[PDB]
Symmetry: D2
């Protein structure tokens, strides 16, 4: 069924499935070993695949992710596509391995210990990944702590491109109903106006920052998603984490402006975060 | 946001959340204790709820399930709706507790041991639940071993009504695209013709039977979902499990006829299974 | 493909297609003559059918309409389902004939002349049809002047049930994205909150009233649908038509409350309109 | 709401709306006059716009079309985008005027008269337009005679890009359910397999050829869309038009192979049609 891509194809025998890194959304990821990089030696990788109960959406999401990672390209702050097994057999999406796990559980672990300097560096990396993504005209639509993995030496990598989109020529104005995006990370226009732009992603980034400065904290604590629909219209926003500068909290608050155009771009978030890092 | 239902409402203070029974699809279920049944004493129950990352689909699915369980009614072979916390707070769907877990893991466990007599009794119960469901004009759309729970004393109960539908006056002809149903359990008309009827559910039941007689076996072993789309058109079907009568295997094969009308009804499946049970 | 319904089936030879009443949404309607009513004589009817370029949505909409008209039942203020040709051949939905055409063009015609007494009577009939619809637990989702036909002797009949829904057991909370409803007639919760209730229909009724008291006027004159999304949030509403009582305009304004629960029910609209008719 | 595009924006005062060219799908088109081309003089154009009853889908389709025409670019066999009025007011999509109307009604008119030489030239132009479209990685999804307009001097132009898609980086594998495409022009994989490729467009082209050689004939005459779902699986295809060469009919039959890969590409259709034109 799946078409073929010569430049990304990888022989099934050079891969050795192993330990399951953890189940999830539309499938599961398992640690594997691959022979082929240009050294031609066995390197640890992560293989994303379907479960036995996969649905057509699961299939289309996994395929979509593989295709998105190809147009996005190479960058140090996003999980890179290494190869893929599509021909004669089960779809296998080969991406790079992240030994530390996802940012959420990672952060919640060290609360050795961790420092503020790290948090700002951590946020800066993510802002850099998102700026690249935006230059590539891609909207992630699902940026969150759980969707960011950390490798050895602690490199922050944005993952899970199953919901991402190509905005190069088409923006899907009044077409994206966004019913599959987690609500606590959604911008108001996404929730109510059937649109999604890079500006919608900055809102989510602000929520991601909050997650970082609360060390894996749960957004809108004590507030169920069900009542968040009215609160967001009333102008409700989250308050400052007791481990955040007043300048950092203003970035968050800026990412959360009702009007998209008034929110900062990823380029600005990079520049401003750059300064804040030097002075720490 | 959620409307109110006096007859099904249950006070939040009479419920005591506990151990998480296991994460999943569009939320999580946790063991809880409720005071109110008519004895007015603390009985163990299961509470279905949303996670922090819930989406609007997750929300609409959970609400849909609660509404479906209300029109379906009471029966001994389906998980019954006990109560629900909708007013002022997080949605809580209170259903009955199943101490043994789901049919799949249950079966895979005992392979004390188990007997053939049990398997036929197990299949008969499920056929009975499905016959009731059909009389209520409800199509489940997701019948599988993982979606059947077993209580103490071993009562088989069909669960997970998140994808079910009300076919009383509307059948959704050419409207149901069924992209969220697991493919290995889907009937051909469901996969290709944009329809779903009670007959589509019998196909799934046949796959459920196979799962039972293989003791939690994985349908279409060695065949990835991706290539199942062409095979199903070619007339491919699963073979007889080495623990199944020749008469039982014919029921399966009958549930898998390309033409829906040629498949048996749930009423027939009940009658025929009734006979087969007596003669064991 | 289409299933069979003995009680509604009608022989293809007893029907004689004729003049096309006018193309449209998902198909076309043509004047026809049928032999079979219980007199057994030739009576003029209207036959809804697909065009050569029909889509699967067109097909599913037309079938959905036929099924909705069956659960709704018989009433003097809605177009009634007379019969249907489903077996061996092109789907034919046989409904009652409306010699005067749709309410919009009808009204715009006489601006012999028409009187205010008529407008209130016209509005009262429609309010009555909608009250019945609501008791049957059906949400129309597309109430407008163009969707109301007038017969000989001037009986107002609500038509076009292609978008209607069965709310008996399921309400589709957070599932109805309503992207196919005309925006100038949509309630705010329908446009932004992924819900639709009987209260959403009263909003549309208010817009229908405005259309009547402006004699087929276009809602939100001088305002393109594209800018209506922001205006509706700002609290913008239409002003009083120069042919409407101050009491009538208050009904409209009541149907347009941001909060659904604060809007009048169809039962109240019937009672209040009843009084207003007597005193004219 | 709509974003801004400096290079495509056109002043509202330089445009003068006129005669309505004909209502339709998700809006209406009207003949207009524009001052600005680089001569800076009044030239006749066609303006696509929304009606009063537009839906969000109508809006998103019209916007999508404008965006597609921008990535597609300039070519002599497709209607070109001249300008657009998006800022402060009703969306206006300015495209080039086609004085003769659509290919279907055009053909059905002359049955002075027309010649076979014309039909082959007509088909060749369309094959050329489609080859360009495909090189631009765009899938039309709605190629038909009604969607092809003819200008003065008889230039064939492919129109209506409301359903088209950008396949540059994403192909939508198992995501396109295609419920809004007219069935008599759909390829089998489109109808049943949730995919759409350039090969799916060649199938539609074959149906377009049939329409040409039958002079605006209706595909699958005497066969309702409702029964076409089973017939297409049985291997049913249309027969040779009594005004078509045996070599031409083989092209049609080649475009209609069940297996996509076995169908000819648009490049081949251009080469082969090129030869056939010379020898006429």
């Amino acid at each position: 069924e799946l078409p073929e891509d010569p430049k990304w194809e990888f022989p099934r025998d050079k891969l050795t499935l192993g330990k399951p890194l953890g189940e999830g959304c539309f499938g599961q990821v398992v640690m594997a070993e691959a022979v082929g990089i240009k050294p031609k030696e066995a390197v640890t990788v992560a293989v994303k695949m379907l479960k036995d109960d996969a649905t057509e959406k699961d299939l289309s999401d996994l395929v979509s992710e593989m295709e998105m990672m190809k147009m996005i390209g190479k960058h140090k702050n996003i999980i890179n596509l290494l190869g893929a097994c599509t021909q004669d057999g089960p779809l296998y999406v080969i991406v790079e391995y992240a030994s530390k796990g996802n940012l959420r559980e990672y952060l919640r672990a060290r609360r050795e210990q961790m420092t503020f300097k790290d948090l700002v560096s951590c946020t800066y990396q993510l802002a850099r990944g998102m700026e690249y993504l935006a230059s590539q005209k891609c909207i992630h639509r699902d940026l969150a702590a759980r969707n960011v993995l950390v490798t050895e030496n602690n490199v922050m990598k944005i993952a899970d491109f199953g919901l991402a989109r190509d905005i190069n020529n088409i923006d899907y104005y009044k077409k994206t109903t966004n019913g599959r995006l987690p609500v606590k990370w959604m911008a108001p226009e996404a929730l109510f106006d059937r649109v999604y732009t890079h500006q919608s992603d900055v809102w989510s980034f602000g929520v991601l920052m909050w997650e970082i400065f609360t060390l894996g904290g749960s957004p809108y604590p004590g507030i169920p998603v069900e009542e968040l629909f009215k609160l967001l219209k009333e102008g409700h926003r989250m308050d400052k984490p007791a481990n955040c500068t007043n300048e950092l909290y203003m970035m968050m608050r800026d990412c959360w402006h009702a009007v998209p155009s008034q929110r900062p771009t990823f380029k600005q978030l990079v520049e401003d975060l750059d300064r804040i890092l030097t002075l720490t």
